Amino acid sequence: ASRHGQKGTIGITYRREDMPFTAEGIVPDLIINPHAIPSRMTVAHLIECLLSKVAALSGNEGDASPFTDITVEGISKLLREHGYQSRGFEVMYNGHTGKKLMAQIFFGPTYYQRLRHMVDDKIHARARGPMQVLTRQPVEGRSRDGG
Amino acid sequence: MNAPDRFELFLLGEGESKLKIDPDTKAPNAVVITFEKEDHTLGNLIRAELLNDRKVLFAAYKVEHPFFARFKLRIQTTEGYDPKDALKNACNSIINKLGALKTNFETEWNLQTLAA
Amino acid sequence: MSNTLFDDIFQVSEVDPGRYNKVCRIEAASTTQDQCKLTLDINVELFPVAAQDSLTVTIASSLNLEDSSATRSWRPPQAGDRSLADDYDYVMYGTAYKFEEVSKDLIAVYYSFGGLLMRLEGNYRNLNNLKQENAYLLIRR
Amino acid sequence: TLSHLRRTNTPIGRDGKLAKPRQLHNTHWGLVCPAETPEGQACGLVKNL
Amino acid sequence: PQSNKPCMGIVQDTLCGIRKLTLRDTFIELDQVLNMLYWVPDWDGVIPTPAIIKPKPLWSGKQILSVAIPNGIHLQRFDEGTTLLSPKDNGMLIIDGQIIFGVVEKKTVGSSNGGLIHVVTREKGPQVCAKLFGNIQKVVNFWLLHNGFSTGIGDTIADGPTMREITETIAEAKKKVLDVTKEAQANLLTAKHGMTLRESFEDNVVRFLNEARDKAGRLAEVNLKDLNNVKQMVMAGSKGSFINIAQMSACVGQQSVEGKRIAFGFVDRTLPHFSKDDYSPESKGFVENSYLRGLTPQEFFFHAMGGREGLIDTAVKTAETGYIQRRLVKALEDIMVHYDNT
Amino acid sequence: TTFTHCEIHPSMILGVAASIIPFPDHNQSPRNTYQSAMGKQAMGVFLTNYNVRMDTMANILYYPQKPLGTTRAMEYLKFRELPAGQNAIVAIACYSGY
Amino acid sequence: MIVPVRCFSCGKVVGDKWESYLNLLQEDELDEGTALSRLGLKRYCCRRMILTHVDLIEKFLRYNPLEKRD
Amino acid sequence: MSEEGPQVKIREASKDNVDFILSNVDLAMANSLRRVMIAEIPTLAIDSVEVETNTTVLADEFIAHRLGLIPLQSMDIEQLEYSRDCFCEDHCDKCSVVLTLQAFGESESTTNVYSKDLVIVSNLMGRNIGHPIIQDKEGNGVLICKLRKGQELKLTCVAKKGIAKEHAKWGPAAAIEFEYDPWNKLKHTDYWYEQDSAKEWPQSKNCEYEDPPNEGDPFDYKAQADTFYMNVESVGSIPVDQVVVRGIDTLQKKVASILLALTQMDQDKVN
C-alpha cells in the first residue's frame, strides 16, 4: 500500500529483460495501472511522485506538509533545471521487441509499505479430517485443518 | 509454497525434444514449430530473419503464457520450397552476421586499445 | 472488356482536416461533367493534397492488366510483376455498402476503404456499372 | 503503539443506531483528529486526540 | 434475469484500448498484422487485403479487429447527428462481420442492451460469445502492449485563460449571493410559495453556488485536448466522469451535512475564526479551491464532515439491508413453476 | 479586527496517524481515513531492542528507508528513525494487462 | 541494518561506498547532492539507495540478545 | 574488412564502460544481443554457506544473502563444469570453489567485516578465478558485517557457476543504454505537449550525430531502423569487451543448437 489509500496485490513478477526501459537503462521496480487515479482523485500521489523524483535527482529532503506555499509549477520548474520533461513523462522502449512506445509514461519514485496479509497465511484446503465431539462435523479453524 | 524451480527455464527434462514440427492443416506449405525452454530472444530474431526471404509468405510467433518457457513459430513458404530449408537458411544467415559483427567489434576494440 | 469501371478527372475545392492528424476529407467537382461530385477520406501523410488541384480518379475491378484473389490470401509484391497499379500513384481497396437514389437522374454510391469513407454523386449512365461489391480506387496526381 | 496510547472510547452501544454521536461536530476543531477513525461498527464512536 | 441485460462485458483497460485501436488515425504495418493474426486462435490462414495497397501496404485497426468478430453479425446504431456517411465517426455499422464505420466503446462492447455481446449471444450461442471475449482481449492486449498508455499530473492542468474564466464565474456567483443577502437583510425579500423566508434565502444561495460549480467544471472540461489521458479514459467509458475532472481542475464546491449547509455548531457561528451572524458562502462550507490547488483549513474541516456522513451510511446500512434481505428470501423460498404452468 | 488569540499552527488539528500522509489536503477525505487505518499494518522496526523480547509474533524489515517526502510533524513521531516502508520506483502504465 | 550491497534496480554495487560517503559529509562539509555525485552515483536509483538509508546497526550494537525489559 | 556485415564504431571505453554505435543491423538483432548480454552469460558467485559460530546481532540467512551477491573474478569460467554434470559427490574440485571467513572482535571499538577477508583454501589448478573484485580506493571492498567486543563469526562458503536467468547474483552487466532515432524521423513516438511539443521535450545528446529534418520534406515512408547507440557497464567480474564478445558467442551457440537439432530431425525423417 501507498500512503494515499491505494493498496493492491502482486499479480505477476517479471525479470529485468521483459521490463520496459528508458533510454538511460532504468527499470521500474513496479508498475501500477492508471485506471486507479480518476475516481479516487488522489492527486497527492502524483504530487508526491513528482516531488520525490526531484528530491532524488537533487539530493535534499522535500517538504510536503499541509497548508504551505509549495506549488506544482514551482517543483516543475525545479525539475526542468535537471533535464527532464516537466510533467514527469519519459520515453520508454518495449522490453520484448525493443521498439519505441507510442505513448510516454509517468515515471518516478514513491513510498510503499508491506502490509500484514500474506497469502501463505490464508491458504487452506481439506479433503477429510478430524470431527467434533458433540455434533460430529468438521472442526473450525485453519490451524486445526477444519472445513 | 508453490514456487517452481528456476532451473526449469534452461534445463530440458528427460524425454523432451528441443524442437517439435507439426504440419498446419489450414494453409498449404505451412508448419508450426514448438521450441522449448526459449523466450522472445530467439523467436523475434528468427522471425525477423525469416521475413527477408522473398519465397517466405508467412512467419509469426507467440508465447502463450509468461509462466512457461516455450513458444510457437509458424512458417509458410512458396510452392516447391521446404519451410525447414527456410529455417536452415535463416539460421545460417544469422550465424554469418554474428560472426562478422564479432570480428568487427574485436578489430575496433584492439584499435582503441592501441589508441588507449 | 477493360477492367476499369469508371474514369474521370476531378478538381478539389477544400480539405477538411478535422481532429485527425493523418487523415483528411476532401470534396471535388468533375471538370468534364457538371453533375459529378466526390467526397473522399484520404491518408495525407502518404499522398499530400492541397486545395484547387486536379486529380485523375479511376475505379477498377482488378489490378491484373490482362484477363480469384477475393478469397485468396494477399501475397507480398514480387520483383518482375507488372500490374495496373504501376501507372497510378495512390491505390486503395474497398467495398461498397450503399447505393442511394437522390433523384431520377442522379445517384450516389458509398465506399468504405477499411473505415475511410467515400461518396460519389453522378448521373445514372456514368455510374451504371458501379454495382460491384469490391473495387480498387486509383488516383494519379 | 503511539496511536494506541492516545485513544478514547464513547460507551454507547456500538450497535446503537444514534447517528449524532457518530458524526463529526463543530466543537471537535483542534481537540479530535477528523481523519482517523475506525470503520465498521465503531465508526465515530472511537476517537483519537 | 434481474434486468434482462448482459452482466459481463469488456472492462477497464481492454475497454480503454479497443477504443484507441479503432480510430481513423490508427494504421498498422505488415509484421504486426502477421503477429496479431497469429494470436487469434480461430484464424483461417488468409491475410486480409490491405486498404492502402500503394505506395505502402497498411492496415486499419478496424480491419484487424474485424477478424475476432464472427461472420454473419450485423449491427446498426445511429447516435446524435450521424448520417449514412458519418463525419464525426459516430454510431456503428457492422455488415457480415466487417466494421464499416464507427468507433467501438462502452456503448458497443460493454454490458448494455442491444450491444455486440447481446446480439452475438442471441444469434450464435453462449460458447461463441465466450470465445469472443478471449479473442478480443488477446488482440487488444497484444496491440496495447506495444502502443503504451499512462496518466500523470499533466492531465489535471488547464491553461491560464481557462483559469481566468473559472475565477470570473466564481466571482459573479459570489456577487449574486451577496446581493440576495443584501435584499433579504432589508426586509424586502419575498417568501416563496408555501415556504418560509429563511428557507427561500437558503434555497437561493444553494442554487447559485451549485450552478457556479457546474459551469466552471464545464468550461474546464471543454478546454481539454484530445491527447489528454483522463479525457481519453472518460470518453472510452472505463473510469471517471466530468465531475471528477471538475473537482480536480475547476473547483470542489459546496460541502453539506444532512441535506443542508454547515449548521451553527457553536452559538451564532460555525467556527471560532468567524463573527457572530455570518451567512457568507465561505463561512458556511463552500470550497472554491481545487484538489490541484489545495484546501484551506476550514473547507478541509467541512469536507471531512461531508465524508464522515457517507462513511457512517455504509458502515451501518450494510447490516440493516442484510436483515431485510434475509427476511425477504425466507418469505418467498418455496415458490415454484409447475407443469400446469401455474 | 478585535482578535484575541491566534492559532499556533493548523497542522496540529490532526492526530498521530494522519501526520504521515504527504499533502493530505489534495486528497479526498475518506482516502485520508483509509490510510490512517492502514498505517498500523506496515512492517518495520517496532523497537530497537526486538532481539531479546519473546513476543507471540514479530515482523522485522531488512532494510528500511526514510521517505523522500516528509511532513514537518514527523520529527516528533520519530518516523525517520523507525520507518515502515521503502522508496520504490513506480511507472504508472499499461503493460501486458497483468 | 547494514547498507545494502547492491542496487535493487540497476544491479550496481553501492555497499562499499557508504564508508567513504560518510567521510565527505563532515570532513569536507559538502552538501548531499555533490557528495552523492562525487562517487559516480548518476542514476537517481543509486542516489535513492544511499540517500535514504537508516543505519540501525549502531543501536543494536550497544545492546545484548539477553535481557531487554518492557 | 567485412563490408557485408554489421558495422561497429567504438567512441568510448574504460575498465567498466563501453560506448559505441552499431549500424547496418536490424532492430531484432540488437535487442536480442542486449537481452543475452544481460541475462545469459555465466559468472562465479557464492551459492552455499555453512556457519560455525555466530555471536553477531544479525541473522544467519541475512548474512548468507549478503554473501550471495559479492562479486568474484570469473575470467576463465569456461573451464569449470556445472555441478549437476560433474561426477563428484556434492562439490568437486573441478566443479566448485571454496572459501573461508573468520573474524573476532577483540578491540573495544567496533570492527567492520569487509569482503577482503575471504580466503580461498581449495586448489585452483592454475586458473584465474575466485579472486574477490575490489574497486574502491582503500581496497576493503564490500562491507559484510559489524562486530563488537567479544563477538565472533566463523563460516565456510562454496561458490559455483551459473547464469542470471535463475538469480540476479550471477549477472555481469549493471545497466545498458539503448537508443535510436533521436529526431523521430520514422514517427515511432508521439509527443505530449501543452503549447509547443518541440520545446517541452529536451534534446538527447545523440542529436549531434544526425542531421535535423527539414520542414519542406514529406514524411519518408520507406526508412527502417538501422543505427543504434549503446552503452554497456559491467559489475566488475568480467571485462566489458568480454561481456560483448561472450554475448555474441552465446547467441551463436543458441542458433547453432537450433541448427543441429534441425539436422538431427531431418536425419530422423530420412529413416
- List chains touching B (3+ CB pairs under 8 A): A, C, E, H
3-state secondary structure of D2: coil
Distance (Å, whole) CA E234 – CA E221: 11
Query: In this structure, are strands H228-234 and H119-120 parallel, antiparallel, or unpaired?
Result: unpaired
Q: Of B47, B64, B46, give the one whose Cα is nearest residue E41.
A: B64
Q: Would you state the cell numbers that stand for residue A90, as one nine-digit string?
A: 519519459
Q: Would you state the cell numbers that stand for residue G63, as one nine-digit string?
A: 545492546
Q: What are phi and psi of C7, to 5 degrees?
A: -155, 135
Distance (Å, whole) CA E179 – CA E189: 11
User: What is the DSSP code (8-state) at residue E13?
Assistant: H
| Amino acid (1-letter code) at residue E219 | L
Vertex A22 angle, CA A19 and A27, to 5°: 40
User: What is the DSSP code (8-state) at residue C97?
Assistant: E
The DSSP element (H or E) to which E52 belongs, if any, is strand E52-54
User: What is the DSSP code (8-state) at residue G6?
Assistant: B
Cβ burial of A54 (10 Å; 0-12, 13-18, 19+) is buried
* Cβ–Cβ under 8 Å, residues C57 and C50: no
Distance (Å, whole) CA C27 – CA C46: 18
Q: Who's near G6: CB < 8 A, 6+ residues apart?
A: G12, G13, G14, G15, H69
Test D23 with E271 for CB contact under 8 angstroms: no
A79: left (phi over 0), alpha (psi -120 to 50) or beta: alpha
* Cβ–Cβ under 8 Å, residues E63 and E51: yes
Beta-carbon-side half-sphere exposure of residue E111 (alpha carbons within 13 Å): 10
Q: Of A102, A10, A22, H35, give the one whose Cα is nearest residue G44.
A: A22
Peptide bond connecting E41 to the previous residue in cis, omega within 30 degrees of 0: no
Q: Which value, to the nearest 10 degrees, does the dihedral of the CA atoms of residues G25, G30, G34, G39 take? A: -40
Q: Would you state the cell numbers that stand for residue E264, as one nine-digit string?
A: 451553527
Kindly tell me the sign of the dihedral angle through the C-alpha atoms of G51, G53, G59, G60.
negative
E102: left (phi over 0), alpha (psi -120 to 50) or beta: left
Q: Please list the residues that pair with B19 across neighbouring strands.
A: B35
Does D have 3 or more CB contacts under 8 Å with C?
no
| Amino acid (1-letter code) at residue C47 | F
Place of cell 488539528: F13
Structural domains in chain C, sorted by start: 1-141 (2.40.50.140)
Does C have 3 or more CB contacts under 8 Å with A?
no
Q: What are the structural domain ranges in chain H?
A: 4-42+169-268, 43-168
The DSSP element (H or E) to which A56 belongs, if any, is helix A43-58
Q: Please list the residues that pair with D46 across neighbouring strands.
A: D9
Beta-carbon-side half-sphere exposure of residue H9 (alpha carbons within 13 Å): 10
- Chain C: give the shortest CA distance to residue E88, in Å: 9
Residues that constitute the known binding site of G for Zn(2+): 7, 10, 45-46
* Cβ–Cβ under 8 Å, residues B54 and C77: no
Report in angstroms the alpha-carbon separations of H9 from B104, H211, H229. 9, 18, 10
Q: Which CATH superfamily is domain H4-42+169-268 in?
A: RNA polymerase, RBP11-like subunit (3.30.1360.10)
Test H136 with G20 for CB contact under 8 angstroms: yes
Q: Who's near G26: CB < 8 A, 6+ residues apart?
A: none
Distance (Å, whole) CA H248 – CA B95: 10
* Cβ–Cβ under 8 Å, residues E154 and E197: no
Q: Would you state the cell numbers that stand for residue F82, as one nine-digit string?
A: 523507525
Q: What is the resolution of this structure in A?
A: 3.3
Test F32 with D6 for CB contact under 8 angstroms: no
Total domain count, chain G: 1
Please measure the distance between the N-terminal and C-terminal CA atoms of chain D and give it in whole angstroms: 14
Task: Return the beta strands (E) in chain H as ranges.
Answer: 7-13, 17-23, 43-54, 97-104, 111-114, 119-120, 143-147, 152-162, 173-179, 228-234
Q: Who's near B99: CB < 8 A, 6+ residues apart?
A: H5, H252
**Domain ranges, residue B25:** 1-115
How many other β-carbons are positioned within 10 Å of the β-carbon of residue A127? 5
Residue E164 CA to chain centroid, in angstroms? 26
- Chain E: give the shortest CA distance to residue H68, in Å: 35
Q: What are phi and psi of H147, to 5 degrees?
A: -135, 155
Report the chain E residue with the minimal C-alpha distance to residue H223: E56
Distance (Å, whole) CA E151 – CA E229: 6
Place of cell 543501536: G59
DSSP letter for each residue of H42-103: -EEEEEEEEEEEE-SSS-HHHHHHHHTT--B--TTGGGS--TTTSSSSSS-SSS-EEEEEEE
Q: Who's near F85: CB < 8 A, 6+ residues apart?
A: A111, A112, A113, A114, F42, F44, F64, F65, F67
Q: Which value, to the nearest 10 degrees, does the dihedral of the CA atoms of residues H206, H207, H209, H213 take? A: 150
Partner residue opposite A58 with nearest CB, options G33, G35, G45? G33
Distance (Å, whole) CA E308 – CA A123: 35
Place of cell 504527504: F22
The DSSP element (H or E) to which H248 belongs, if any, is helix H240-270
* Cβ–Cβ under 8 Å, residues E166 and E219: yes
Q: Please list the residues that pair with B61 across neighbouring strands.
A: B73
Distance (Å, whole) CA B50 – CA B56: 7
Mutate to test the interface with G, among F43, F47, F50, F52 (most CBs of G within 10 A): F52
Q: Please list the residues that pair with C55 across neighbouring strands.
A: C10
* Cβ–Cβ under 8 Å, residues E124 and E201: no
The DSSP element (H or E) to which C55 belongs, if any, is strand C54-60
E45: left (phi over 0), alpha (psi -120 to 50) or beta: left
User: What is the DSSP code (8-state) at residue E248?
Assistant: I
How many other β-carbons are positioned within 10 Å of the β-carbon of residue E121? 16
3-state secondary structure of E60: strand
* Cβ–Cβ under 8 Å, residues E233 and E16: yes
Method: cryo-EM
Report in angstroms the alpha-carbon separations of H176 from B3, B37, C6, H172, H240. 30, 25, 58, 11, 11
Breaks in chain C follow which residues, C to N over 2.5 Å? 67
Place of cell 513523462: A89
Does G have 3 or more CB contacts under 8 Å with A?
yes
Domain CATH code at residue G23: 1.10.10.60
Distance (Å, whole) CA A109 – CA E86: 45
3-state secondary structure of H106: coil
* Cβ–Cβ under 8 Å, residues E6 and E115: yes
Q: Who's near E185: CB < 8 A, 6+ residues apart?
A: none
Domain CATH code at residue B69: 3.30.1360.10
* Cβ–Cβ under 8 Å, residues E247 and E290: yes
Distance (Å, whole) CA H241 – CA B105: 9
Q: Roughly what angle, to the nearest 10 degrees, separates helices A72-80 and A43-58?
A: 30
Q: Of E35, E227, E116, E86, give the one whose Cα is nearest residue C115.
A: E86
**Domain ranges, residue G19:** 1-66
Test A59 with G8 for CB contact under 8 angstroms: no
| Amino acid (1-letter code) at residue H225 | A
The DSSP element (H or E) to which C100 belongs, if any, is strand C90-100
Q: Who's near G27: CB < 8 A, 6+ residues apart?
A: none
Q: Which value, to the nearest 10 degrees, does the dihedral of the CA atoms of residues E75, E80, E82, E87 take? A: -120
Q: What are phi and psi of F31, to 5 degrees?
A: -65, -40
Q: Of G50, H36, H34, E153, give the one whose Cα is nearest residue A23.
A: H34
Output the 3-class SS for G31-61: CHHHHHHHCCCCCHHHHHHHHCECCCHHHHC
Q: Would you state the cell numbers that stand for residue E339, as one nine-digit string?
A: 407443469
Q: Who's near C138: CB < 8 A, 6+ residues apart?
A: C57, C58, C59, C60, C84, C85, C87, C88, C90, C91
Q: According to the CATH classification, is domain H43-168 in 2.170.120.12?
A: yes
DSSP letter for each residue of E110-147: SS-TTSHHHHHHHHT-HHHHHHHHHHHHHHHHHHHHHH
Query: In this structure, are strands F69-70 and A62-63 parallel, antiparallel, or unpaired?
Result: parallel
Q: Please list the residues that pair with E288 across neighbouring strands.
A: none
Number of H helices, E strands in chain E: 11, 8
- Chain C: give the shortest CA distance to residue H219, in Å: 7
B49: left (phi over 0), alpha (psi -120 to 50) or beta: alpha
Partner residue opposite D39 with nearest CB, options F15, F37, F46? F37
Q: Who's near E264: CB < 8 A, 6+ residues apart?
A: D26, E270
Q: Would you state the cell numbers that stand for residue C19, as one nine-digit string?
A: 481532429
* Cβ–Cβ under 8 Å, residues B66 and A14: yes
Kindly calculate the radius of gyration of chain A based on its CA atoms and give it in whole angstroms: 23
Test E156 with A89 for CB contact under 8 angstroms: no
Distance (Å, whole) CA G3 – CA G14: 8
Mutate to test the interface with H, among B14, B36, B41, B68 (most CBs of H within 10 A): B41
Residue B92 CA to chain centroid, in angstroms? 12
